[PDB]
From a paper:
Argonaute proteins are the central effectors of RNA-guided RNA silencing pathways in eukaryotes, playing crucial roles in gene repression and defense against viruses and transposons.
To illuminate the structural basis for RNA-guided RNA cleavage by [name], we examined [name] in complex with a 21-nucleotide guide RNA by cryogenic electron microscopy (cryo-EM) and single particle analysis. Resembling eAgos and long pAgos, [name] adopts a bilobed conformation in which one lobe comprises the N-terminal, linker L1, PAZ, and linker L2 domains, connected to the second lobe comprised of the MID and PIWI domains. The catalytic tetrad of [name] comprises residues Asp585, Glu623, Asp655, and His792. This implies that [name] adopts a catalytically active conformation. The negative charge of two phosphates of guide RNA nucleotides 1 and 3, as well as that of the C-terminal carboxyl group of [name], are neutralized by a Mg2+ ion as is observed in pAgos and PIWIs.
Residue numbers in the entry: 27 to 99, 103 to 193, 198 to 271, 282 to 307, 322 to 589, 595 to 817
Amino acid sequence: IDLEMNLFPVKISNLKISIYSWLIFPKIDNYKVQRNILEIALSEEALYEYIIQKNKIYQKKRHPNIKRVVLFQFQIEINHLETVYLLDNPTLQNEIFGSICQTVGFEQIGHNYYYSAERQSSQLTQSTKESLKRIFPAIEIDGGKYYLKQGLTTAIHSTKKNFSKNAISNVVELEQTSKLIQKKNLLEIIMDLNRKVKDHHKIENLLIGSRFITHYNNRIYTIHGIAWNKDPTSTFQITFEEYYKKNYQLKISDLHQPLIIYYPILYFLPEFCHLFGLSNLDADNFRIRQEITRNTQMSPSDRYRKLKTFVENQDILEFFKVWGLDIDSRMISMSGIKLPSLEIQTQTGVFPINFEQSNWLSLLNRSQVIDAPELKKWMILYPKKSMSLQEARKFSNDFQKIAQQMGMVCRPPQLQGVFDMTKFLAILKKNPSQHHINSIQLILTITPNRNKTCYRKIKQLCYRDLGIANQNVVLKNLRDQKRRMPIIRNLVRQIICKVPNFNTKYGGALWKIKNNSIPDKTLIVGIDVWHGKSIAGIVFSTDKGLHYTANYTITPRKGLEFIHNLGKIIITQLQNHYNATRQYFENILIFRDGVGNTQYNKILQEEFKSIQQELTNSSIFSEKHPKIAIILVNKRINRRLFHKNKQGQILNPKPGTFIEDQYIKSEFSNYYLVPHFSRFGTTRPIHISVIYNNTKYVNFQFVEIANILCHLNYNWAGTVRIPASVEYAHKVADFIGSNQITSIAPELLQTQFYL
RNA sequence: UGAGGU
Ligand SMILES: [Mg+2]
């Protein structure tokens, strides 16, 4: 099965690069006049071949330092600083690549590059310019409100003894990425909110956590606060108005505007910012989401053609070859391996997946469930202001009949309406005896407001004070009839997994696998971190990826990603399993989440040493050490795989296909897995990094296991991208962090409360 | 917050 790999083999010439430093006698840092005067000076000296990267200049040939006064509108310095070969340092190679991509027309936003119209270089011909405009058009969203800039994310990587026919020195990764910006500035948004909200604190709540790009400097930041008592007229030590006039030459319109705060404390003027991504007021708009998804999702044929016509452009290739990087227009020839077909089973029948058919909602709608606890004393909460009595009764009735159809035996609930929708549960917690808090197994909730404060309040209060699981639906999302029945069926699906069982205190199980490649006597561990007070979530599964007994901890330092006491909470669960079953786990697979960018490897080794110390210290488990496997799986990658049929047509790789990365120079064995299926567009794979292994089975079985976990995600009826043990950990972390839980009641920890 | 891929 032939495949193509979006890494172009780049032949890099050992060009001698000279680094020059420039200074300007006047105290001007306008980011545009400095470049202009530098260009004037370079033209005066007549060095056409040059590269400008902020404070340094790249040249192919070393020439002496020239300083001269430029008569404009004034001493321009040149200082030789560095000269090493290009081949040795990938950092340089990336810098020249980025500067060239900036020259050809792209703008460096964050770490990516995005096309534009004004910041362009004239040496490009009109045909090439039109082709680039077509390939990377600035799409308009919402009829003049949102820009959708389409550009490339790039990286230069060294090869690891590549077979081809000669070994290539380096490869280049190219990914087409679309980024959304909003036309309106921050000041307009805050004024609009103040018009209707009329509450500064509520405005801070709505605006906090959002990302914004400043255009005068074009850098991205996160909203950490807003000072309303602070005005541009006030002074700060190096007034903000004078600071912008001198440093950036931008006229200020609002002298009484508040200033947004982004501490490492820096203050930014909202009139010169723009929100990042979809607006919160339109976050879940169906038509808006459909339009953006249509405009950013490229069919595999479309994406492949776009990439091929971009790379095959002889003019851009000449531009890059000038600076020693000869990109090969062809693509890496490659042969992949398809994992064995997987068969899903339930309590009713056995139905293999075979080719495609990677969604099985029909199976769950026409069959029963595996594990489901009887619902006896469950509560139903509906708003009494938006009172629909007979509608509430019929909702209870159809919920009951669907639960009966799903194999989950259910009892009539206690339909109760509240004005407050929050204080009823407070009264419930105040009186255990009257309300029988321990008797309630589940409290279904209906809130019509969708506000993120009430929802967080109910999910935190039901889990920190009572320990009764709840399920939330927005009343508007329920009133319509087109997707009401699917929504209620998915409600049954989530409730099955979200209510504790009486026997083993476990959640429900929806499907299993007929033949799991997961070896017997194995504890699958999935760990993720949500960084905000940052929380690390962990999930252990003694069975072959069926039930997860989650746990959480506070990462010692905010922003840091390293668990201090991983070994303690792992040996605790091993001891619990030994006490329960008098059995010792033969294998322990750790599917930790992260990016192995030379820091996560050290962190993972530190965690491994910590767990080794704890487990050797453990008297019970010292003499028999369970085998350990530390495997990194990654979500945010810019890699893709393209598939070729006999007729030479682009197609998504068949789901479950995988490959071993023999090109990137990494110390550990990497694999690329496409687990899922998407109807439209190329599907982004996942990066299985096998950092540490002691277990007998080869890494191929590990990739197969990860694919199995992918084909076991209970939240989505069909296959998913990230293996369930990792997404579950991420969901644990997101739930604990977002809802500010002080401590989850231990009884619910074994339940799948994160779904 | 019906939910995953985008
Ligand atoms: Mg949910």
